[PDB]
């Protein structure tokens, strides 16, 4: 699987890093280039793919 | 090696709100015989019961008693738990486990899992099985020289294990520390050294070669073993 | 003393060993070559046996040299064969069993 | 951890996924329905005790779309949009998982029944109620 | 089984297996299943009768062939999975009554036990009197022989 | 492996105990035995969480067991009863090292004396 | 030998067979059966030799 | 938990006495052949109660060659030995002018403690032992031949007789159980005497490396 | 056979001799037995070959020197005397020690 | 005691989990995704039979009497109907070491009596 994803805001490949704070059940995805940050709830089954997913979904929902 | 699981018939986690009255009449009577007076603190007690039933057959086979098992529980967990047991003259062997105040039921489940496997009542770890037999071949019999000056073979009991704990076994009381050996040559090297492993490797190779009745001159075996041990460590032929 | 040493070397009762010179067959060959009659007394002085065995033992060397290291190594290298030789070429055996001249 | 968890490995998924998640993704959310598809005699408690760890592993993913979100998440190629991912997962389940059962829509019940049968066979093997299959048996060859 | 023996809807190649201990019936029409013909046994009797042998003796004239045996439900093709559920008599002598019956519930009988051998091993005379590796060696040397 | 799981299990355990234990240990001061205590070494604190009153109750049970044995066998002397009970209690305290094990041992002794009395 | 093996089987079927130390019931039964058959083979071989 | 501990301590003491005697230190025959009853008499019987205490089992012996060469054998009560206790032992060795010591640990010793052990090596030679290792004397096993430490003059004579360099001899590791038992360091040569089924006797030499 | 038949015939006891001839079931069981040995040969060949090559490569340059020591190519002493007795293996014989027992 | 089965919530058909009433000290079975609750009566939330003394007669099914590959005997009649013929077989199941024990099934149709000797 992939842990570094392309940022939906600046389109920089592999510029997004994902941090899984399991103790607080929160995943934080941050772009290194444009410094955009997003926080989502996560479960023990969650992965950086699902944090990256929740971010894309939040973007598309907010852009409606 | 003997864990608790090897001597238990079954387990069960009940919900006994008060030890004064339990869910089984036998257990209630025995406990209230035990619960005559406050030998404890009532506040620091949980209602979650963990009842363990042992096999009289296995315990007798190992000459184990619920006192030793309870002492092992105390050693491995401490006074933070509460283990009580009935007399051995009862119909069944039973012991009850509680905790002094994750959930308590899930915690009891975790304790029961660990108690069955990790906790050891008897024996040495890594030794899974032991066979006891009287040898009929002179290679394992005790050979002595009588006062008349003759070689005499005495039949004696010897034990054969499935694992190897050579250092621990050698230190056990009534175990011969001169003859007790292993077929695992790396353990021999670790415990006894390089000359010992030289000799043991020679013996194992001789056993393998001569099992068929075939014979190879000693100097070839000696040269191989010397080649494998001359540098102070075990040199594999690889 | 050789017997005690052997008891140490072979703590079991296994007397079967692998050694260079088949002494029993050599004694049998000597008996046949020189037409030894076992039923008559021999002319072999028992002291001749002891001295002869000593010289022979001196004559077969695996580690040569006169220093103490060489002497001990030579003693060790031929210890088993020398025990066998002394227990086969005894004066008692030579006199009452092999009857060599 | 404590119990024995059952995990299914699907084609085009590089990580194992709990079986209950697969059943939920097929459209069976309630534990009762999944157990009915897996266990046919509810009076058998031992089988029920043997399946509890699988339910415990997947108790937060109580919705079909979340399960299809999960499976799509475990996939080799990660689509940026969830909609493509749930659809990709829906594609994998409908087309790549158990094709001989069916490859058309509205076949999720047949897939669920066959997966439940597979889990039932696994449970029977685990409980020692059925002998393991022999790979050299010529009836298992073509 | 009746349908397959009559060849109405189920062709002879089809395998039907009932696992009684389990509660499964498995039917296979796939390709690649190895099967062999066997004689069907009723209560304790072969369905193959003297009349079938008489008809086969004149197969040149009456056009009575092996296919007619299969059509009359006297012989059956059995694959390995179905063989797992068959009670097989080695010879019709096994169907005779004994002071102590062994099976008494035979479903099939072998046509002849020598059919277990292949082409090369079928030319060995008295192969049941040899050590098996020698039969194996002949199975290759026969392929190396000159003719 | 097993060693890694044993330490991890211990880590899981101690924190659960801490959750299940008080911030500070409400040490109930050891009750000093009355001068009339017939229990040998009544002032000892060798066995943790064991009260002198529990020892007195156990000695009372031993007294009852010895009385039953005497009446069944018609023992003559009476002073031996108290001395024997005190000696049994002291031996049990000396041997055992945990309260529950101590009580179980005393009950086992009581059962043994009861069986001996039954035998006659 | 065949009758002896039948007797051993009948004993095992009625739970009148006890496992030898270090062996489960099945291993004990197989040991007895193989002992009987090996003894029969040895006896027949000796007769043929004679 | 008490009688077993007493037996363990007695066995460790017996093995230590045998080791000291084999290393050339002065030990009395009674000390070597001390029964368990004599151990319970001279020492305590209830290690849980503190009698005997491990600090009461410390032994001091002097070499036969010269009294000034002395060796300590203390048994720390702490199951695991750290740098601090090593420093205490080093300080008392300084005070008493003792340059050698044996330390018998129950559970083990910390890596930094081992680094300290090797750090002050040239000045003080203090070695480590697990009591599990000392519960039996490995030199008495039938598989272990007789090991004899050679003097420098003997090594020179050997190398001159066989015209060898040190690196041409067979090797024994300094961490070898027998090498640790005899306390031999790198550069020393041990002479091994073993019986042979072909020659009767055979002497081989191993260099410590 | 019937299910759970543990009798000699069921489990592969051939009660016939080669002259009498085997019954079909005995024939098949005997074929299974022989197949076992054929397979064993076919696999042991390669296993043993690799072992042999490794042994040879491990001891190829060890030889007796003119000082009678055994040394490897690096001139390290492997044995101070070959076989601990300094003898070749083709000239020794089995003999019995007369004073051991 | 025996095995303790699982319960399902009446409102959402999900597995119920044991819980206690801190104020009342009684055992309850409460759902997780929902808030449904139920009063227990067994008071035994877990069981683990190490010896595995399970009844193999329960698992046997009477249909096995139709298997032509099973042996049949006329020396162990059944009591339910008195039929003299029966099939017999072994446990052939893991967790059964002394599994050479025979089990019998009556061959009379519509009787299906299983028993052991
Ligand atoms: Zn960005
Ligand atoms: Zn619910
Ligand atoms: Zn009936």
From Swiss-Prot, chain F:
Full protein name: ATP-dependent DNA helicase Q5
Record text about domains: The alpha-helix immediately C-terminal to the Zn(2+)-binding site (residues 438-453, characterized in C-terminally truncated contructs) is required for helicase activity, is positively charged, and may play a role in DNA-binding and choice of substrates.
Origin superkingdom: Eukaryota
Outcome reported for the amino acid change (mutating residue 13 to A): Abolishes interaction with POLR2A
Outcome reported for the amino acid change (mutating residue 103 to E): Abolishes interaction with POLR2A
Region annotation Interaction with POLR2A: where it falls in the sequence: 1-120
Protein species of origin: Homo sapiens
Effect in UniProt of substituting residue 102 to A: Reduces interaction with POLR2A
From Swiss-Prot, chain J:
Gene Ontology molecular functions: DNA-directed RNA polymerase activity; nucleic acid binding; zinc ion binding
Transmembrane segments: none
Highest rank taxon of the organism: Eukaryota
Pfam families (alphabetical): Zn_ribbon_RPB9 (PF02150), Zn_ribbon_TFIIS (PF01096)
Subcellular location: Nucleus, Nucleolus
Positions annotated as zinc finger (C4-type): 9-34
Zinc finger map (TFIIS-type): 74-116
SMART domains per the UniProt record, alphabetical: RPOL9, ZnF_C2C2
SUPFAM superfamilies associated with the record: Zinc beta-ribbon
PROSITE patterns: RNA_POL_M_15KD, ZF_TFIIS_1, ZF_TFIIS_2
InterPro entries cross-referenced by the UniProt entry: DNA-dir_RNA_pol-M_15_CS, Rpa12/Rpb9/Rpc10/TFS, Zn_ribbon_RPB9, Zn_ribbon_RPB9_C, Znf_TFIIS
Gene Ontology cellular component terms for the protein in this record: nucleolus; nucleus; RNA polymerase II, core complex
Signal peptide interval: none
Protein's GO biological process: maintenance of transcriptional fidelity during transcription elongation by RNA polymerase II; transcription by RNA polymerase II; transcription initiation at RNA polymerase II promoter; transcription-coupled nucleotide-excision repair
Subunit structure: Component of the RNA polymerase II (Pol II) complex consisting of 12 subunits.
PANTHER family attached to this UniProt entry: DNA-DIRECTED RNA POLYMERASE, DNA-DIRECTED RNA POLYMERASE II SUBUNIT RPB9
UniProt name for this protein: DNA-directed RNA polymerase II subunit RPB9
